[PDB]
Amino acid sequence: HHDQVSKFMKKMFGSIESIIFLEDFITGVRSVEGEVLNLNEKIELKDSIQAQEWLNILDTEIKLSVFTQFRDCLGQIKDGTDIEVVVSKYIFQAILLSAQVMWTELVEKCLQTNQFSKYWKEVDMKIKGLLDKLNKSSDNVKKKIEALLVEYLHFNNVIGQLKNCSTKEEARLLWAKVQKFYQKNDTLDDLNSVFISQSGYLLQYKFEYIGIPERLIYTPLLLIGFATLTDSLHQKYGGCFFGPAGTGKTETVKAFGQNLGRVVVVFNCDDSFDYQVLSRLLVGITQIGAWGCFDEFNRLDEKVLSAVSANIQQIQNGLQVGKSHITLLEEETPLSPHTAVFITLNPGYNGRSELPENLKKSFREFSMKSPQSGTIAEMILQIMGFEDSKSLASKIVHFLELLSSKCSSMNHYHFGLRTLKGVLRNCSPLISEFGEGEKTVVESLKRVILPSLGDTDELVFKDELSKIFDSAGTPLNSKAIVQCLKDAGQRSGFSMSEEFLKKCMQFYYMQKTQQALILVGKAGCGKTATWKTVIDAMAIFDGHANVVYVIDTKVLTKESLYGSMLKATLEWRDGLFTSILRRVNDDITGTFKNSRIWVVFDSDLDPEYVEAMNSVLDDNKILTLPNGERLPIPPNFRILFETDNLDHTTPATITRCGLLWFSTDVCSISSKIDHLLNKSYEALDNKLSMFELDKLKDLISDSFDMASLTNIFTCSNDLVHILGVRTFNKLETAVQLAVHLISSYRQWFQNLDDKSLKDVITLLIKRSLLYALAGDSTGESQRAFIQTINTYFGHDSQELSDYSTIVIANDKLSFSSFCSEIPSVSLEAHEVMRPDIVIPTIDTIKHEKIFYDLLNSKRGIILCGPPGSGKTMIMNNALRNSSLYDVVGINFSKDTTTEHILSALHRHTNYVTTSKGLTLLPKSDIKNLVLFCDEINLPKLDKYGSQNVVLFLRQLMEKQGFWKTPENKWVTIERIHIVGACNPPTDPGRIPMSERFTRHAAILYL
């Protein structure tokens, strides 16, 4: 066949992907990058020809063909030809070398004359000329221009530096440090004609094809690395750089190779890599005379490491001596003296790693350091469309550096270069709106850096931003978004406060640039409100619908969520995160093109889960399967993360995504109430006449004013709270209770006295307010708080007593206020011990009444208290009595799963497939069901520290529906209640609960 060899070339060459034929004749080869190289002589083939014979000719011709394309091109530029001309007809590898040789020649003479300025503009113009050519160019040649730009920037940078030198000695020093590409206008053996000088040392360009690789930006640091590599190689020693991950040590060795026309073979060591394969590859590298880099050499297993390290010595000892043949893998194999071994050394937990002893007198160790960013910044600004790239790069860095020294040391704050690359990345669309000016940079600083800052640091940013550079007075997209945001919130129930507008604005501007968004804040900050409000405002402003998928991240396993593979049958089933993407990608049967897709993760985020998606967070925007595939994500599809803390996540994960730190709650105590009330009234409209509703909403408004409550909520803090929850999150507990207690007595509000009516209202409100602030209190404290309520409420208004109650007649509508009445119990001998026996107390009735009231509200209940305090019985007996609710008992243990909860429910529940909610999970019988979760603070948490079972209940409490673990669909639970008992978490055995779950609970400490 012949054509079937092209597959295997990718491996044995590294640069090329597939080979080009005219069948009888080989016209050329194409690289993994897409670039097409054509040979000088097309190599003739016959059927009875061997692969080894024909391919060997190709390796030779592929190098010659590069020299041809190089000399052809170099000669052209020498004859005053614009570089824009050359690009279109010559392969990158060739044009790059031609530039380098001419550049070097042109600057070499320019050191003598000192005619730098004349050459500088000249170069600068070629840069601008290349840039504008790129905008109008075909994607393939688009790679080639960009790759060349990296180089031309290097050229001009060095010249500019050279212009600046105090003297000529200063210029000859700087020039010596640089990689100078010389050609011999003397000689034969053309493959050996090009050589490279640096620090006085020379190094022959071998002519291997490199294709068009992603070329690293030239840094002083990069040249120094190149300089150490050349210094080791000159004395026939191995190059080795140790240092922290992400310092680009292998990329350097890749680039150092390219600069010299070499495709480096990189061994990723200990990625479950066989010794037998490496031993083969080492023989091949010593024969073919290639460069091998050991990528993260440190990570090898001791048996392997010994064996490998000893082999490597053979090679490096063979070179230093120059032995023609060296023995390794117990066979006599010949050694090319062009061969080199490179070792990159990532650090361990213990320290920056070391080479094995034998390798210490065979290699030269060097310390890679992160690049001082200024130099990277300037080039990046140059590429976009500079304005003054030098001033911005100095100014941006100074400012970022300044923030770092001037802001508080906060965990998630990164003012490292990653951050400035990000400011710069965000800058490009921004430039489109405004200018390649500082002003566009200024805006991008506050688009990225500001959404992640917290109030103290928020001014430091503003103070030092104006201190370093002042740009402008007025902002675009100022009116238009804002009225679309106000209109969305009025509709949603929300209040546009300073902060809620702010964090809504911060968010709007970020979705634009960022595709992964993070929202971090305390439980009940306003996140769900911010994004649900902004996303809603965009369907008003753009006209694009949204399709939101809110998933609890840590309720499901990595297997339930990304895609789980079974070890033996290798049977691949979808998951949750991947399956909702296949609607958009695989079969966009309906309208997805014009829609916006948002996949929200409401639960706490951890390394293991984000690592399994890191590819979407990368510049890739594709999903990588454990087995089988990569699925690409559209620009519509945005992933949000709402969470309470970050401690677990990596700085690398933050800096890929857009981070939105909610310093404080978006909204005022009052404003919360306001929304809460109206949210409660809407529920009632479905089960209450408008005449009734209109009158009852009027009552609420005139009974409780904010001025009184402000002190009440303030005094709430001056109090000892078991199972602590903050004041702001306790609010929903008041209003939901209060409105239900008043809708309770609705009928007796028709005919009752208007002064007396207010007294019924005020009493209920004083009651509902008590359990919502002091319900989880000692009750020794409750009694104390009761007086505090009475104090701050109107003096004349019906005062609260410990056992204060409102009573109406058995057989006739009536109205009077009497408290503490008890039915009297007589039980037989056999009855004495029974799992369901209550001897009612003044306090059993007190708790059983309030407990029942909260369920009428349908707010979840946490009964916290000591063992044998009766929290289980009070809950059980109030419900074992009534026809309405039916109890279901689950005991939690240190390690209980979310399936146990489901299985216990399946016994008393019946799924119905009604088209109204799709799947629903009401109770197996008509009337309401109550899950009693006993020992709720018992199940343990992921090593990160996140109890999924609790988050699952939180899913049921907040979302009201859950995702099916195997079948992968949304089922909305109907009419089911969550109640829990727990012990004080000061007790041993006990686990601290997430505020994000306890916020939806009324807590009664008994």
Binding site: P867, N891, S893, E899, H900, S903, A904, H908, S924, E935
Partner: protein, 91 residues
């Protein structure tokens, strides 16, 4: 001990097989139970009255044996009894 069943042992199909066998024995004894809930509560109640766990821990000082006494389930539903030393008379 907190419940009187281990949920995991009998789940899914093995829940259905248990549930089938449960109906057989319940009727054999002479009682049919209207609901699915009425059945399981017989099963659990039977375990609670027929299975009896005695723990023998030697050094309660040991961190693994401390975890026994610690465990709430065991602590509440067990009768803790002390025999820690032989007295001079019993010796």
């Amino acid at each position: 001990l907190a419940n009187a069943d281990i949920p995991d042992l009998f789940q899914g199909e093995e829940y259905d097989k248990l549930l089938n066998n449960l109906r057989n024995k319940t009727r054999s004894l002479g009682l049919l139970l209207d609901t699915e809930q009425e059945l399981y509560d017989w099963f659990v109640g039977e375990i609670a009255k027929n299975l009896h766990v005695v723990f023998t821990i030697c050094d309660p000082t040991n961190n693994k044996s401390s975890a026994m006494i610690s465990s709430p389930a065991l602590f509440n539903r067990c009768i803790i009894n002390w025999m820690g030393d032989w007295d001079t008379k019993t010796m």
